[PDB]
């Protein structure tokens, strides 16, 4: 009863961070060693759980969130961080119990002339609540004017595109991120190891 992990990690395309994807994992067994024993990952921090213990612990349902950001922003995917990504795109709760996995994906997500399919949110009237997905495309009002659905002076379209090129500096290169969330409600647990 294998859990669909190669689905999440080996997916052809990844989601933009503002429209981050979430896959629920339920009613299956999963080996976490086939993951945390890979040297391919550039980042593997865990919170509220020993990664080694994951093979013998068991949880209600598991959430796998995935998206693309640029390298310098990977540090923002952590409990209690601030910045453009942590505030307007994807925010972790301070009580976060799970693991954050990230690896460079310049060979998949960079394109000659620039891959503009990956977007992030530059402006938002307020900070995101944890695990909130804001896909609003209405125009930001940075001044006092009513933009009437068109962009002008201090009337900004809130989403902006990464220009991922193969020659970008490593800090501006695309990174694929997967966030595993583990919750233990009072409902029966259906995701455990061997």
């Amino acid at each position: 009863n294998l859990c669909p992990f190669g689905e999440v990690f080996n997916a052809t395309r990844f989601a933009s961070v503002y429209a981050w994807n979430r896959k629920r994992i339920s009613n299956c067994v999963a080996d976490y060693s086939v993951l945390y024993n890979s040297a391919s990952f550039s980042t593997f921090k865990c919170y509220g759980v020993s990664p080694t213990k994951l093979n013998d612990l068991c949880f209600t349902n598991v959430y796998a969130d995935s998206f693309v950001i640029r390298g310098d922003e990977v540090r923002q995917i952590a409990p209690g961080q601030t910045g453009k990504i942590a505030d307007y795109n994807y925010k972790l709760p301070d009580d976060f119990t799970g693991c954050v996995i990230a690896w460079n994906s310049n060979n998949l997500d960079s394109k000659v002339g620039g891959n503009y399919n990956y977007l992030y949110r530059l402006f938002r009237k307020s900070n995101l609540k944890p695990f909130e997905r804001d896909i609003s495309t209405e125009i930001y009002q940075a001044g006092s004017t009513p933009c009437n659905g068109v962009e002008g002076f201090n009337c900004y379209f809130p989403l902006q595109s990464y220009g991922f090129q193969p020659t970008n500096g490593v800090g501006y290169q695309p990174y694929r991120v997967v966030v595993l969330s583990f919750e233990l409600l009072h409902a029966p647990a259906t995701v455990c190891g061997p």
Epitope: R70, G163, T167, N168, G169
Partner: antibody, heavy 128, light 108 residues
Framework: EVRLVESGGGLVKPGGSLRLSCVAS????????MHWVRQAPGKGLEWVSV????????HYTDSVKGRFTISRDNAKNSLFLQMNSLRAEDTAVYYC?????????????????????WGQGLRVTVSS | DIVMTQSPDTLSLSPGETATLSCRAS??????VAWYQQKPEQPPRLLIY???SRATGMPDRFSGSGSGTDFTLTISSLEPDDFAVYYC?????????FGGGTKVEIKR
């Protein structure tokens, strides 16, 4: 003039550790991502490590991941390679390397193509 | 990891002739290839980037061509200074990889 003065190499026993330092001058150090490349005796060139301008992003070749750590102090124009649990195959001449910027005008993301400047090299000998 | 195979290992030529050095990649790297010269006890010197673009101050007898997986460095009218080791490098796929090198030796 662009200059990269290197220091901190030399002799070590297997399982030992070193810290290579590279002080930059003649250019804006904080605007450049920086690399370490190495060359074993009689062998060719092997890329080792890269760090972004801010230092928030680092990347390593697989044979040194988890043992080597690249870092930088932009206030002191300094680049460092910390080498732990050194192995015999880590013996080489080590170069700090500045890649060539091709960032056009005022785009936010930097772009680089090849290595346009190299330090003189530090000998690192790991032997019993 | 992309392997950069240089060929041949040695060319034996005299001054005034033309050196043609080949580099082949195990998969496509578009035009993201560079060529360096190395002399004994010195760091490498960048000669060509972007497959065909000369570094600042390179003589025009150095020229580069190719794309995808096939790349060539041509040194026209070899001078006594040009007899050295030459490396190709791809610089967009991690880890960055260099070719094994080609030595241009004096013919006799």
């Amino acid at each position: 003039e662009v200059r990269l003065v290197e220091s901190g190499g030399g002799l070590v026993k297997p399982g030992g550790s070193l810290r290579l330092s590279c002080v930059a001058s003649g250019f804006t150090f904080s605007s450049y991502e920086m690399h370490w490349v190495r060359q074993a005796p009689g062998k060719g060139l092997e890329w080792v490590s890269v760090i972004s301008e801010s230092g928030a992003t680092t990347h390593y070749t697989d044979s040194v991941k988890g043992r080597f750590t690249i870092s930088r102090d932009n206030a002191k124009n300094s680049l460092f390679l910390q080498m732990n649990s050194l192995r015999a195959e880590d013996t080489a001449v080590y170069y700090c390397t500045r890649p060539q910027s091709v960032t056009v005008f005022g785009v936010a993301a930097t772009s680089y193509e090849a290595f346009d400047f190299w330090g003189q090299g530090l000998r690192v000998t790991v032997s019993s | 990891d992309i392997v950069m195979t240089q060929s041949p290992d040695t060319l034996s030529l005299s001054p005034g002739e033309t050196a043609t050095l080949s580099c082949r990649a195990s998969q496509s790297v578009s035009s993201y290839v560079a060529w360096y010269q190395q002399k004994p006890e010195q760091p490498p010197r960048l000669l060509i980037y972007g497959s065909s673009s000369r570094a600042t101050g390179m003589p025009d007898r150095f020229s580069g061509s190719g794309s995808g997986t096939d790349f060539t460095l041509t040194i026209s009218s070899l001078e006594p200074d040009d007899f050295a080791v030459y490396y190709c490098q791809q610089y967009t796929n991690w880890p960055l990889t260099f070719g094994g090198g080609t030595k241009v030796e004096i013919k006799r």
